[PDB]
Design a protein around this nucleic acid. Structure first.
Lengths: 138, 136, 138, 136, 138, 136, 138, 136
RNA sequence: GGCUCCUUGGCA
RNA sequence: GGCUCCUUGGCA
RNA sequence: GGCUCCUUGGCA
RNA sequence: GGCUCCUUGGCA
RNA sequence: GGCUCCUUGGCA
RNA sequence: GGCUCCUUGGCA
RNA sequence: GGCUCCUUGGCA
RNA sequence: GGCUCCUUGGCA
RNA sequence: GGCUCCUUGGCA
RNA sequence: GGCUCCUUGGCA
RNA sequence: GGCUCCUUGGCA
RNA sequence: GGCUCCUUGGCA
RNA sequence: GGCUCCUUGGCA
RNA sequence: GGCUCCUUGGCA
RNA sequence: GGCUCCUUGGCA
RNA sequence: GGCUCCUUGGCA
RNA sequence: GGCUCCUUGGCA
RNA sequence: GGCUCCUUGGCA
RNA sequence: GGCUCCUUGGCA
RNA sequence: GGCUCCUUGGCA
């Protein structure tokens, strides 16, 4: 239902700081949850599942997105762009979201919010290409 | 352009006193998070953090002297680090705009804590500066 | 025999419309006969005799029923109640029906049919009182 | 509650066009015969009859125009009077429920005459209304 | 017959206000009857009998319901819940309703209406337990 | 959130002027009956009732002055108490949203009585407020 | 949008030096652009179009302004006044500016800046008369 | 009034050495651009330019001698022409205010180029003048 | 050198 | 060593 | 970037 | 979204 | 909802 | 038509 | 007879 | 009527 | 109308 | 305009 | 001193 | 000080 | 002292 | 909570 | 509940 | 020969 | 055909 | 799509 | 954005 | 920018 957006925001913060600060994912999860004053169970558990599905499988995801960068190493992107793409790939593919378009909207929203419009368009294009590659992979 | 630099430096010093890691990496992190564009803000904030880190023990002594008997370790991270930054710029960088420094610092205190801590930091800073004037 | 009920129905319609519409009794008789598709001679002639015995003697009848209304003017009743009482008095008294109870049953039936149950009980009571007054001159 | 009112009004108009007496007395007669209980049915039917009687000649003209050349006097009493009522309510009372008016009227035609007259009255009424739409 | 529901509603209002406002039961009965525009005799008299059977016997009833609250004092419930339970016990037990299920339906309906769903479920459970205790008192 | 508070206060004042019991208990009763959830509505309505009860005689005087010669005791409970509440909030609480107060009050009058009383209360309230503007 | 003022300044320099130094318009354009450190494309192209529209049509313009000098030969004016009037006529008439008043403000500003107040008033009056003559063909 | 005349003359000589056109026309252009009002400034600057143009080759020789082996064609236009003007006024016009000439010239060098060229021109000019003193 | 001041050059 | 006003030019 | 005025759309 | 409002309903 | 009075269907 | 119910319709 | 909620539409 | 979010262009 | 900004000059 | 530090003038 | 016309700073 | 204004800090 | 827009978070 | 769209049932 | 309707009845 | 009411079922 | 009450889940 | 709401921030 | 009250600047 | 002053600079 509705908790999904908040869960995605939390997960994005956790991944962003995990990449940037190199701190433990669980500890950063505690930090983000405490500072955001998260209470409701669904959002908490969904965010935890998102973060866990992002951390486990991280390299597979990195490879997946690095395939669509046209030979460009993933460190050549922005922190926001990169991590948001990671979360997006995790949710869309690894958890097989039944609401792909919704995930697109929310993710792109997060990218616009934390970075800017152009980053949003970039992430949108890349992730769209990735999902187009995924859906017809079967 | 100095205000944002002061906010930066404050956050960096805060994370240093909290986590305990290397100030440079923390600086990189804070800079990355707030998206610092302007060059002067970067340079300035960096100079602030460096100045604070080099003189840190002397700064702590100067602050503790005006704490009215308190141990500096017992202050809140916000008050303590804001006082650190304030003393750093006012004394060791010899800021030619002390009033503005007081402004920015106290405002920072009121942002990340209650105004109750704001007037306190203002008072301690005032005492420290008044002592610094008659020092030399 | 059997034609009596139909004759009574026809006569009742004729009287009801005579009182209500103020139209000529003979013309209304033609109307009712034509619209009911009456054919059989006995019913036709019996209905005609009923209507004629109702029209001639009408005021005498009105007085008779008005005696049993306990001072109440006859216009204070319903059209159905009034006219049915008129027909009933005509048949019972003026033609001296040899089948009084039968006339009662049929008349009360007509009253229930064209108005309602309570009107039927009312007409029944009134007409019964009238006939009780009529039979004992002895 | 409108249906019974329409049946009432139809019977009244019919007896008016037939006998030729005063519409009010006829209305009283019809009301007495069918035993009208509800107030709204009475009021409504009365308004219908009044509206029809006031505008009667104009109504006859409007109807006759769509008769395809026929004289309105040559129509059956049922068809003619039902058309009268229909035109009265649809046009002069500006009914906001035209479809329902068509329904009730045509049904009335099918009750007191064959459906053969029903489709006819439906057609004439449809033509009249379609003309009324583009009138103003 | 049908007047029972209305009677129960009236009685419930009277009890609710009797408990809340502390005003005289008869006066409040007059108030509720006047404001609801109650006319029909059966509803009036039935409501009066319900209220009277509720007021007289009130403490006995209170004890009865307080037995099933598992040691919980009756003032710990809501006004609606409490008073509706009082009326329910009065009707089911003291007047020995021959239509227990009907009383259940109507009472629970009143509880849902004046409070909420959960209050309805609560009252339902409690009253059901009470009636289960009553029927096998034989 | 103010509207429900005004309805509350109105009902409370009404029951006070009617029964004559203690306003606090009546307030508890009304609050219990309407199931007030929100805190601000409770607090507000309570402040309204208190303000009205404290200043009640002065309020009655102010209202009676604009009644055009009538005795305030001769007004309907609805009109009288609604005027009481209106004057209380508009004058003694110095409401910064007078138009909205007029709205809510007049609406309350139209709910528990005819609109005929509504325009009247609106007029009296308008006169009172216009007088209050030029008072100080 | 905003580039217009800068374009007008550049054009004015080019015309002033074209009249004074007699050097090639394109070369002087290169000089002014290089020395002003002009980069943004809109300003560059707009200035180029202004200069080109001034050079081509130059004699027509000269005649136009010479009509409003009341028989006075155009060489009797100042360099600033003359050339600014040329640019003004070019922009207002030949390019048909949709922002005439704006052009007036900027041109008069340039005249005040490079010469003095009185020159500004003079140019203002003359150019205003010219535009008044231009706008009314009917 | 001499300073502006020197700036004028410098610009004129510069444009001469750059473009290669006739010094008189260039003088007219520069005078027109800077809006020279005062008569003495005009006359003076004109005398400076004329004196420089007449003696130009001798001036170039004198300058080149003190260049420490450099070709005069390899100097920046600013340094070269400022030196030209300086030598012209100091030597051929026999200025009675040499210090002031040094001032104005060096300042002109610092305006249209970096001070790095300023000290250089000052040095060369000093050498040239010191040589001129012992010449006769 | 004890007063009131003014113009002005270089310079952190 | 720190500013004021303003001009031109580059971008949010 | 911030404020504000229209204007072409999709709106709440 | 959201007030006044001339009009027709829907649910209870 | 609540209130006033009358039908229909079906079950005893 | 003695009398209970279920589901609906219309109604001041 | 009197309420709660809500939809469409006519006008500012 | 008042309030407002975006979007296509042009302004203070 | 404003503000910041990457550059270069005139005035105090 | 302030201002740090060396100057040059010159007025009552 | 006197005379002709233009700046700068600061105060209303 | 009589006009047109702009930037901006603290504050109920 | 009363708002606008928006972000996050808790619930109907 | 309000509107609305499907969907699994019991329905009127 | 509730219209059209191809079909079979029931009651009167 | 023609009406009132009502049940089941075929189709939108 | 149109209207509608609840209920199991998923949406704007 | 909306509204209210228990919390905390950015913009005007 | 409004706004109460003390300010600082600065433009024609 | 309406208009008064104070102190200076340059100038036929």
């Amino acid at each position: 239902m509705r908790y999904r957006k908040g869960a995605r925001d939390t997960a994005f913060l956790v991944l962003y700081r995990w990449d940037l600060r190199g701190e433990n994912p669980g500890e950063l999860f505690k930090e983000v949850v405490e500072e955001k004053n998260i209470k409701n169970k669904d959002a908490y558990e969904y965010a935890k599942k998102l973060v866990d599905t992002a951390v486990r499988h991280i390299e597979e995801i990195d490879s997946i997105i690095e395939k669509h960068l046209k030979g460009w190493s993933i460190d050549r992107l922005g922190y926001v762009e990169r991590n948001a793409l990671r979360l997006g790939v995790a949710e869309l593919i690894f958890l097989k979201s039944k609401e792909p378009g919704r995930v697109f909207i929310d993710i792109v929203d997060l990218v616009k919010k934390y970075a800017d419009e152009k980053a949003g368009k970039f992430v949108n294009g890349v992730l769209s290409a990735i999902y187009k590659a995924y859906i017809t992979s079967s």
